[PDB]
Structure 1
Amino acid sequence: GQRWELALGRFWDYLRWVQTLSEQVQEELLSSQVTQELRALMDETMKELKAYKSELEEQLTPVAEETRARLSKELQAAQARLGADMEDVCGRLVQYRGEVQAMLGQSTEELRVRLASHLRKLRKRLLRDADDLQKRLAVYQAGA
């Protein structure tokens, strides 16, 4: 099932737009609008993913509790790793907003060079934990 993949696709596209640090992105960065819109997207992905795991617990093949429950603890953790990535990205954008206030009108060009470099790394990490969680979810899609 892929309702949570679509909701993550929307998170991921928005963040790809933020990564460009265009005029409008910078505007909405110094206000609380992109961390407010990324929270809403995160929240729909996690909502939809909790409900997909819930419905997959209905179509599980014959695995004994020390293995079927080893697997949900490993899957709740990949859900948790992905949530923690998205929160990390929003905290790095809050940090940028603060660091622009503290410049007191001075050039933020060197600040946007470090942000773009840092955001790319976070987004690299985010994408590999979504891929990992899809794998654990696909092995669980049938049981073990």
Structure 2
Amino acid sequence: GHMSGQRWELALGRFWDYLRWVQTLSEQVQEELLSSQVTQELRALMDETMKELKAYKSELEEQLTPVAEETRARLSKELQAAQARLGADMEDVCGRLVQYRGEVQAMLGQSTKELRNRLASHLGKLQDRLLRDADDLQKRLAVYQAG
């Protein structure tokens, strides 16, 4: 909820805004989930978010003068843990939609009514994990810049 207005927080928003369109499961989504256009574009947004985040952490790892270099070792790892957590959440969303592309054609197709219901709940859980871990990453960034 509290963004610092960086390039990564927003490529993240471009990823999250795309997932909201997928969760509507409209005809265009039902059509585009059969193909790989969604997963290709979601992978692009995931990679774009992680490269901007990587460049942001690099700029932050060279800030105010230290006294003895490190109180950052513990803080830099907890920040790296949150960075890897965010990327793992975005991989889980892509991996789930890849399974759905095959599940909609498993044994030449399955019941899409129950199939879209299980996917919608699973996407909602992944979305809630992505939103919370994005806020935790912001907390780890603030702690890192502070001490």
> What is the TM-score with the length of structure 2 in the denominator?
0.89
Aligned length: 143
Contact 1:61 1:142 survives alignment (8 Å)? no
Q: Deviation string for 1:107-127 (max 9, x for gaps)?
A: 411100110011000110111
Contact 2:8 2:49 survives alignment (8 Å)? yes
Q: Distance in 1 between matches of 2:119 and 2:61?
A: 40
Shift of 1:98: 0.9
Q: Deviation string for 1:58-108 (max 9, x for gaps)?
A: 223536555311111111110001101110111111111111111524541
Please say if 1:74 is aligned against 2:78.
Answer: yes
CA 1:106/1:81 → structure 2, altered by over 3 Å: closer, same or farther? Answer: closer
Q: Secondary structure at the match of 1:141?
A: helix
CA 1:118/1:106 → structure 2, altered by over 3 Å: closer, same or farther? Answer: closer
Contact 2:86 2:133 survives alignment (8 Å)? yes
Shift of 1:3: 0.7
Flag as ranges the 4+ runs of structure 1 deviating above 2 A: 60-67, 103-107
Worse overlay, 33-42 or 1-10: 1-10
Shift of 1:27: 1.2
CA 1:125/1:104 → structure 2, altered by over 3 Å: closer, same or farther? Answer: same
Q: Secondary structure at the match of 2:70?
A: helix
Contact 1:60 1:140 survives alignment (8 Å)? no
Contact 2:103 2:109 survives alignment (8 Å)? no
CA 1:22/1:103 → structure 2, altered by over 3 Å: closer, same or farther? Answer: farther
Contact 1:4 1:48 survives alignment (8 Å)? yes
Q: Taking every aligned residue pair, what percent have the same amino acid on both sides?
A: 97
Q: Secondary structure at the match of 2:65?
A: coil
Q: Distance in 1 between matches of 2:92 and 2:24?
A: 18
Q: Flag structure 1 segments of 5+ consecutive residues without an equivalent.
A: none
Contact 1:71 1:140 survives alignment (8 Å)? yes
Shift of 1:138: 1.7
